[PDB]
Amino acid sequence: GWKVGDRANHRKWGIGTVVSVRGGGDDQELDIAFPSPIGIKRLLAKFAPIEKV
């Protein structure tokens, strides 16, 4: 699934970079760093409004 360094386009926050991935592969939790001033958001990958790249 998701990997550190991946870029994600989020419906709300635009494009950001994955800085942490945890939980098991079936319930990944992502930290995604969006450019200033949004900062880092922590969210469950399941049902997240994100697309890779």
UniProtKB/Swiss-Prot annotation:
Function: DNA helicase. Has a broad nucleotide specificity, even being able to hydrolyze ethenonucleotides, and is able to couple the hydrolysis to unwinding of DNA substrates. It is a 3'-5' helicase but at high protein concentrations it can also displace a substrate with a 5' tail. Preferred substrate being one with both single and double-stranded regions of DNA.
Subunit structure: Monomer.
Family in the record: Belongs to the helicase family. UvrD subfamily.
Name of the protein: ATP-dependent DNA helicase PcrA
Organism: Geobacillus stearothermophilus (Bacillus stearothermophilus)
Organism phylogeny: Bacteria, Bacillati, Bacillota, Bacilli, Bacillales
Full-protein residues shown: 673 to 724 of 724
